[PDB]
């Protein structure tokens, strides 16, 4: 009898073979091709053999014509699906003649340390490109480090020019590098919605990940309206600090852009806060936005015009100014102004009487 | 029955000390609680204002500030019987009094101004007649 | 529990409108309103002035409407419904109304102290016409 | 003897356990539990019948206790790593009882495949505690199709599991399918606030999704203010609609709660749209919020008040309520300031001075 160890391995089932209630599949502890008869087979779900659900075969001969005819045995562990997805290690420690024959196994054999990375960019935003009239785009690239000939090549509809970017950073703490790839383009091409791919070239894998990105043909046009609101009376009764609010409604599409103004100079960006658009409740998606702005109240009780502006595609000149300051009361009522109106008239006739009898006692008194 | 006897509203100025009476119907051996509610068909639960004070079952609030609005309701129950909920007296914290011009009403002031105009004119006519029309004779 | 009214205490300026609501079942008959001023402890039957006062009765809802108010309307109101199957009077918790005036603390003090000064001055003119003509005409 | 078909499934080898020079591997396509004996396990490499390494073992008689005496066979295809990573379709074509079982194959490690989508994790709000005493916690996985093999467990700070979850989500139009895996919890544990975590598993990824959630501590408590602003006077002239703005300002921490009472019953939950906090400019650690509400112009001309409620754990009695209709303004003195007296003085002095001219002019004459 030739004392021979078996070819100890574990073969895994396919991922989509779990069926039943609950969905189950099985395993194979291949310890085949062994002589002599003595062998011990034990699974391990993370350092523990599970008792039930095990179908261990017997020491059975293989089809061999010459040489030492060995034997085969195969344990079969019925397993569950969520357990198999749960990254548990499964070791079938075979002990053929008391010899530790393990096979650490699971189903997680992905790992990909490679070069082909995600390559995209932001579109030219309507807020930014209004300020400089300088529609450009910046290719966002991570999951790549500093190799040679790291190229940012913005091909056009059929492969045209690109300004080579400058002002590179250092590498990220997770070893990637910001290939900060910018290029200025024409002014109406994105307004006509052209196809702009950040084709890249790199040393290890030069694969250009293309981006057929253009202007999203779609949403229609509506002029927003701008309704500046004056502060609250209890709030100034606290006489601490007030809150003017500029409010827009109903514009289409999104990405509107506001900033305060007074005397022509801008305010500090840390002063005033805005919000992103929200969907409108009643109508379809004609959004709205708001902006709050603190002051000193001792600043506010003097004057100081305080205007608001706005920036939408729908607006023909892209700028509208509104302002209300401290005294824009707006028609409280008519019988109140008639009330103290009439009392003002009665006081007027009173003092005209006292002057009248000043005169009629003056002429008689000055004899 | 008695479930409307408490008056509808009450006038209390700032800093004052309040009074609330709940004229029950049962025989004096009950439990007396006070609760503070909202508008109506309320969805947020109320909270326990306080127990009774005296055998009159009065409720007294001291140091009224401008944050003491809200509908107050007496709840009183004796044993395992039914519990009584009133309709409740609304409150408004109304301090600022005018420095009172008590020695007239202004509806009475300016009619005195008009009649004083009549009396002052009719008093004002005749000595100017009597002097120069008794002078030349 | 069965009849439910709202709001509870209103404070409107002289001139505007108020509305009052009364929620109970559309099962046994209609609702009749009341009126009760501060003096009584026994209510009355309400008049509905043509034009100035109105009333509606929707599905499970009925409403008194009043336009154009003034100081003779300081009432404490009641929607009342007696049962038509058990003959039991059911009655809510009323409402109150108290009608404010136009001016503010600024103008009120100025016109009060001002016209007090005016009546002080013209009473001094009565002093002039109660001292001068008697002493002069009596020589 | 019934014609019972087996379970054909290629128990694939892992990519690491290879032996030989060049490195070799076996393909075991074990289909058992079949009666009668007749079966043809034909190995097809990219559709081409394999002759090398085909070890079709004996069709052993499964002497099962119940039913017919079924059979078992365990085929074996010895290949190489140049074959296992050769990217060929090792089809275990099983012609069992004349029924061709083309077992589809793969020739690498198979991750699935390249796609990962989204997952949310909603913490329970404060106002969803003192209403129902039902301190839930969920995590919405979404943006998929409602399939099987989903599992949404939940691990504490200890890594142990907690309670199961019913009412897994349902049929949705735009492939916006989802699920809601909830588990109950105590209250002082949530107040102590350690990192509770939910993980999800589908047959979509080999990756768990360690969404982490807890309660932060250390933030202070501050009472908020409320103001209420009547609408835009230009906007009435356009003759279409109004707005109202609630406004809370200058509080701590987040998680505020609002709704609207008018007529006595609260509104629908879609007439009004709230917002989320974002930090204050001036004070270093506070926030604010908004609330919008729209009604027509025939409505706002005719009385018809509105009311705002807030809800926050630092307000001293948890609830306040401000309300602005049109004119609730107009300070004290119901009755007086008069009407009779003023028009009276008007008429009396306008007649009285015209009755003073003819007295004064004769004094100028004589």
Swiss-Prot record, chain A:
Pull the Extracellular topological domain ranges from the record: 1-345
Ig-like domain boundaries: 6-106, 124-214, 224-325
User: Which residue ranges does the record annotate as region CH4?
Assistant: 219-347
Q: What is this protein called?
A: Immunoglobulin heavy constant mu
Q: Which GO terms describe its molecular function?
A: antigen binding
Q: How does it assemble?
A: The basic structural unit of both sIgM and mIgM molecules consists of two identical heavy chains and two identical light chains; disulfide-linked. N-terminal variable regions of the heavy and light chains form the antigen binding sites, whereas the C-terminal constant regions of the heavy chains interact with immune receptors to mediate effector functions.
**Impact of altering residue 259 to A?**
Has no effect on IgM BCR assembly
Q: What is the effect of changing residue 305 to A?
A: Has little effect on IgM BCR assembly
Q: Mutating residue 349 to W: what's the consequence?
A: Blocks IgM BCR assembly
Q: List the disulfide bonds.
A: 29-92, 139-198, 246-308
Q: Name one GO biological process term.
A: adaptive immune response
Region feature CH3, mapped onto this chain: 113-218
**Transmembrane segments annotated in the record for this chain:** 346-366
Report which part of the complete sequence is shown: 106 to 472 of 474
Q: Which disease is it linked to?
A: Agammaglobulinemia 1, autosomal recessive: A primary immunodeficiency characterized by profoundly low or absent serum antibodies and low or absent circulating B cells due to an early block of B-cell development. Affected individuals develop severe infections in the first years of life.
Processing after translation:
N-glycosylated; important for IgM secretion and its localization at the plasma membrane. The interaction with FCMR is glycan-independent.
Where is the region CH2?
A: 1-112
Alphabetically sorted, this entry's keywords are: Adaptive immunity, Cell membrane, Disulfide bond, Glycoprotein, Immunity, Immunoglobulin, Immunoglobulin domain, Membrane, Secreted, Transmembrane, Transmembrane helix
User: What organism does the record attribute this protein to?
Assistant: Homo sapiens
Q: Superkingdom of this entry's organism? A: Eukaryota
Q: Where in the sequence does glycosylation occur per the annotation?
A: 104, 167, 174
Q: Name one GO cellular component term.
A: extracellular space
Swiss-Prot record, chain B:
Q: What is its main location?
A: membrane
Q: Which GO terms describe its cellular component?
A: B cell receptor complex; external side of plasma membrane; IgM B cell receptor complex; membrane raft; multivesicular body; plasma membrane
Q: Which regions of this chain are Extracellular-facing, per the record's topological domains?
A: 1-111
Q: Name one GO biological process term.
A: adaptive immune response
Q: Where are the transmembrane segments?
A: 112-133
Any keyword Cell membrane? yes
Cellular compartments annotated: Cell membrane
On assembly, the entry states: Heterodimer of alpha and beta chains; disulfide-linked. Part of the B-cell antigen receptor complex where the alpha/beta chain heterodimer is non-covalently associated with an antigen-specific membrane-bound surface immunoglobulin of two heavy chains and two light chains. Interacts through its phosphorylated ITAM domain with the SH2 domains of SYK which stimulates SYK autophosphorylation and activation.
Record-given protein name? B-cell antigen receptor complex-associated protein alpha chain
Which organism does this sequence originate in?
Answer: Homo sapiens
Q: Which residues of the full protein are shown?
A: 33 to 169 of 226
Swiss-Prot record, chain C:
Q: How does it sit in the membrane?
A: Single-pass type I membrane protein
Please give the range of the full-length protein represented by this chain. 44 to 182 of 229
The main place the protein resides is membrane
Q: What is the lineage of its organism?
A: Eukaryota, Metazoa, Chordata, Craniata, Vertebrata
Task: Give the transmembrane region(s).
Answer: 117-137
Tell me which disease this protein is linked to. Agammaglobulinemia 6, autosomal recessive: A primary immunodeficiency characterized by profoundly low or absent serum antibodies and low or absent circulating B-cells due to an early block of B-cell development. Affected individuals develop severe infections in the first years of life.
Could you identify this protein by its name? B-cell antigen receptor complex-associated protein beta chain
Q: Which GO terms describe its molecular function?
A: identical protein binding; transmembrane signaling receptor activity
* Tissue specificity as recorded in UniProt: B-cells.
Q: Give GO cellular component annotations, separated by semicolons.
A: B cell receptor complex; external side of plasma membrane; extracellular exosome; IgM B cell receptor complex; plasma membrane
Q: How does it assemble?
A: Heterodimer of alpha and beta chains; disulfide-linked. Part of the B-cell antigen receptor complex where the alpha/beta chain heterodimer is non-covalently associated with an antigen-specific membrane-bound surface immunoglobulin of two heavy chains and two light chains. Interacts with LYN.
């Amino acid at each position: 009898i030739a004392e021979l160890p078996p070819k100890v391995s574990v073969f895994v089932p396919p991922r989509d073979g779990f069926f039943g209630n609950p969905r189950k599949s099985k395993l194979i502890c291949q310890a085949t091709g062994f002589s002599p008869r003595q062998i011990q087979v034990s699974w391990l779900r993370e350092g523990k053999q599970v008792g039930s659900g095990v179908t261990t075969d017997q020491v059975q001969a293989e089809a061999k014509e010459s040489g030492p005819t060995t034997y085969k045995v195969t344990s079969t562990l019925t397993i569950k699906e969520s357990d198999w997805l749960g990254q548990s290690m499964f070791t079938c420690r075979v002990d053929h003649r008391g010899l530790t024959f393990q096979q650490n196994a699971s189903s997680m054999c992905v790992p990909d340390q490679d070069t082909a990375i995600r390559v995209f960019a932001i579109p030219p935003s309507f807020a930014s490109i209004f300020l400089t009239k300088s529609t450009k785009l910046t290719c966002l690239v991570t999951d790549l480090t500093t190799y040679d000939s790291v190229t940012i090549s913005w091909t056009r509809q059929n492969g045209e020019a690109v300004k080579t970017h400058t002002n590179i950073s250092e590498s990220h703490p997770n070893a990637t590098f910001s290939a900060v790839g910018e290029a200025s383009i024409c002014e109406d091409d994105w307004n006509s919605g052209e196809r702009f791919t950040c084709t890249v070239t790199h040393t290890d894998l030069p694969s250009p990940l293309k981006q057929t990105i253009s202007r999203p043909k779609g949403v229609a046009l509506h002029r927003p309206d701008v309704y500046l609101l004056p502060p609250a009376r209890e709030q100034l009764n606290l006489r601490e600090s007030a809150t003017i609010t500029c409010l827009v409604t109903g514009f289409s599409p999104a990405d509107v852009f506001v900033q305060w103004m007074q005397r022509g100079q801008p305010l500090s960006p840390e002063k005033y806060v805005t919000s992103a658009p929200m969907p409108e409740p009643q109508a379809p998606g004609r959004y709205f936005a708001h902006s709050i702005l603190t002051v000193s109240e001792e600043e506010w009780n003097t004057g100081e015009t305080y205007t608001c502006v706005v920036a939408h595609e729908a607006l023909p000149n892209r700028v509208t100014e509104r302002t209300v300051d401290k005294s824009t009361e707006g028609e409280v009522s008519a019988d109140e102004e008639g009330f103290e109106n009439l009392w003002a008239t009665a006081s007027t006739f009173i003092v005209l009487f006292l002057l009248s009898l000043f005169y009629s006692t003056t002429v008689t008194l000055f004899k | 029955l008695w479930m409307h006897k408490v008056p509808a509203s009450l006038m209390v100025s700032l800093g004052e000390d309040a009074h609330f009476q709940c004229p029950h119907n049962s025989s004096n051996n009950a439990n007396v609680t006070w609760w503070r509610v909202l508008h109506g068909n309320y969805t947020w639960p109320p909270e326990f204002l306080g127990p009774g004070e005296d055998p009159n079952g009065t409720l007294i609030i001291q140091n009224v500030n401008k944050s003491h609005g809200g509908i107050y309701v007496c709840r009183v129950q004796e044993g395992n019987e039914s519990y009584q909920q009133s309709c409740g007296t609304y409150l408004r914290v109304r301090q600022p009094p005018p420095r009172p011009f008590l020695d007239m009403g202004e509806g009475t002031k300016n009619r005195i101004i008009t009649a004083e105009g009549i009396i002052l004119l009719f008093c004002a006519v005749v000595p100017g007649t009597l002097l120069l029309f008794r002078k030349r004779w | 529990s069965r009849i439910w009214q709202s709001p509870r205490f209103i404070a409107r300026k002289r001139g505007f409108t108020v509305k009052m609501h009364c929620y109970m079942n559309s099962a046994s008959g209609n609702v009749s309103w009341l009126w009760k001023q501060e003096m009584d402890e026994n209510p009355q039957q309400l008049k509905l002035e043509k034009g100035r006062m109105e009333e509606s009765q929707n599905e499970s809802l009925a409403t008194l409407t009043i336009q154009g108010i003034r100081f003779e309307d300081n009432g404490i109101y009641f929607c009342q419904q007696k049962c038509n199957n058990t003959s039991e009077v059911y009655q809510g918790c009323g409402t109150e109304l108290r009608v404010m005036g136009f001016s503010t603390l600024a103008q009120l003090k100025q016109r009060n102290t001002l016209k007090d000064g005016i009546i002080m001055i013209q009473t001094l003119l009565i002093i002039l016409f109660i001292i001068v003509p008697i002493f002069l005409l009596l020589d």
